Amino acid sequence: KPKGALAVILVLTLTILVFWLGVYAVFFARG
Amino acid sequence: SRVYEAYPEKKATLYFLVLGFLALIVGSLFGPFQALNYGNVDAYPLLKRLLPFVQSYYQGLTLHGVLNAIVFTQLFAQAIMVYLPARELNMRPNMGLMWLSWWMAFIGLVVAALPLLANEATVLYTFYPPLKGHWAFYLGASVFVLSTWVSIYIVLDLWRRWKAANPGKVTPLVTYMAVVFWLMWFLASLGLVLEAVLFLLPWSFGLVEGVDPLVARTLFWWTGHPIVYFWLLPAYAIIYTILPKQAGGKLVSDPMARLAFLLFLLLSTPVGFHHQFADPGIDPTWKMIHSVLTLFVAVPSLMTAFTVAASLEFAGRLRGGRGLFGWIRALPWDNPAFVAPVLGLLGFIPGGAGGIVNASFTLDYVVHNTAWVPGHFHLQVASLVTLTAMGSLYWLLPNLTGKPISDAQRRLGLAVVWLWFLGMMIMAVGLHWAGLLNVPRRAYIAQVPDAYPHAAVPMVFNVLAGIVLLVALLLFIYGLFSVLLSRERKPELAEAPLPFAEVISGPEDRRLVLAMDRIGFWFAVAAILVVLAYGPTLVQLFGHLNPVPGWRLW
Amino acid sequence: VDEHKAHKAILAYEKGWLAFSLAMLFVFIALIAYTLATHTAGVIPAGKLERVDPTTVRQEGPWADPAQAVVQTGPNQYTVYVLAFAFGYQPNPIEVPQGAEIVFKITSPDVIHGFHVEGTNINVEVLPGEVSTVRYTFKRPGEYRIICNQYCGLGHQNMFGTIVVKE
Ligand code: HAS
Ligand code: HEM
């Protein structure tokens, strides 16, 4: 299995989620 | 040289590349001063003593954006996406058209540069009406961009000559990537060509009194999204088809690479209302439709992440690396041609995450026109695209000139790409954090030093980035001219083949590649998506034109 | 073999990643659609074309007297006519009550400006010849800064305004 390639897309997925949910939270705090 | 008589395409490719790097150097000089500005340090009195034609922060910012993001990126794309396919097919491009494309780019640049240097077009690289630039800027920029229409013809010619001599054969991979790239750019370019011919040129010559700024922006952003995919795809072509060989491996899938490029042909153009979420007079229904299509244009990059990571892991295992993370240490970290694009890909992770936030309609009201947006795009174009172009010099320049790279020049190259990468990462922290504190983009904030007290900590990052990138830029200048102006030549380097990767094939591949080789069909589908995405809004706008007078406020 | 095994294992996991990718993007679309059905959507500018002549907006009609710019249009609703110009905003200050719905009608007599209210989601481009219409309810009284966040010429970095929200 491409375990190394899996580790990269996990880090990419967590980066997307922290960015997106962080700004979603900001948007409601300002709303 | 007998090599230039057999491969005159080497000399023309070289003139594109060198003109591109010269534009990058001149535009980049302003970068460190802008970073210091976003650190609340005003160094413009010093810059004005060095370059006394600079009248303002905003003239510097215009030069920065035009030369780095329009001129350097276009000339790199014209070099790579004509030369790589020529060499893969072993066929000569039409050299009359290749030299015409170069002369159009050169003349377009000279004519646009004159009013930019004279402070007659301080309108930024978006030139939004009713700010009214000098006619020579709009004419020069038009001629510069229309150079690319000659490049399209050159590659469609190569492809048609190949097909006629190889009936029944699927397009080879690099030629496939270049054909769908150039056809996407044809469709993309029409927004800006229409804005220039219908509005900006007659307006700037005084033939019409006013321009509708809402229609002007709508045509601009038709081209203004896909142009960033135009910048990106030459870097992806190198990352798919050359990087795996430089890493010690192979490309793990030809069809997954073709499919990423096909999705960019379909999805790059019909999405530009993601630049207009904060514009009046555009129905929110259409904004939501462009938001959804923008999220889909992320898929080919999410796919690229997996296909490239799997290829680098394959190379690391081949070279002896074991475990979860041992494949990383086994890769050639002593080779700047390998290191530069791989660091670019690491910064592209947070760069892409920021883009997905920007695309998400209502979330854009948090970040629109703040320092967040420059934080995002320096990770995409100023890091991945630029570092991939800097790394290419270690294998492309010897191939074009026969000039060897010394072990010393190799080591200096490693220092340049690490400092450039690290400088871009530090600036990204500063700009994203300042954006969330409501610091605006496009602003000489160092002239209002008490206006943003909340941003004191991220401002320290912007100062540190300005210094690091100034050092990287000076080392880059020294290295590039060390190579170009060296006397030694070894013509056998000039006749060596390019380092194209081998591919691992599977039983699937034949069937997938035939369906994707129907380029006439996919072009039709791409065209119709642009009609449906733009047509209804544009009918509305052109029916209700409200032209307004021009202003000079500089 | 090694290569052929690796190729089959790589494509197998890539199929899973692409299904996961699609699933995640679909969940983001659902979370965006939710914002459009709440009060937080009032900061989206009106899609209607409302044309005005930038050459007469300071002479005739609702932007011509800044002291009569705040108009009660509803039992808990005020409409404010805001001019963004080189280089300032009128009225200055804008004075509105806490807890009411505010409809901002912004235009420009000259070039494009931004209208970004610090601490809020109000963040709208202002085009000459067009009216930008957005809605917001202020929950907290105090002073809110307006920032010009669209490059509008040499006075851009100094272009600020003031909203005063009264208890
Ligand atoms: C090359 C240049 C650019 C690329 C690429 C780019 C990508 C995106 N952008 Fe963007 N952008 C926006 C949305 C996106 C989205 C959805 C993507 C997507 O295409 C991004 C998808 C990318 C990914 C999902 C990343 C995948 C990750 C990869 C491929 C790395 C893997 C790493 C590996 C393999 C390494 C492993 C190796 C080891 C050794 C471990 C939006 C709105 O939706 C705005 C307007 C915001 C506003 O308010 O003005 C915007 C604004 C800009 C502007 C400013 C324009 C201006 O002046 O006003 C520029 C110049 C720009 C450039 C670029 N942008 N963008
Ligand atoms: C030494 C390298 C660099 C530094 C320190 C740097 C820094 C900056 C900073 C701080 C800004 C924001 C200024 C503002 O909003 O007022 C900026 C804008 C920009 N930079 Fe860079 N930059 C560099 C290189 C590049 C490169 C290589 C590219 C593209 C290939 C690029 C493209 C841009 C663009 C398109 C803008 C926006 C212009 C506009 O808003 O009109 N930069 N840069």
Ligand SMILES: CCCCCCCC/C=C\CCCCCCCC(=O)OC[C@H](O)CO
């Ligand atoms: C295999 C399992 C399948 C199912 C898994 C799917 C995951 C669902 C995710 C999000 C739900 C979205 C619901 C929207 C609710 C939003 C609530 C919110 O954010 O409201 C706070 C705010 O303060 C209000 O004013």
Ligand code: CUA
């Ligand atoms: Cu008004 Cu910037």
Ligand SMILES: [Cu+2]
């Ligand atoms: Cu875009």
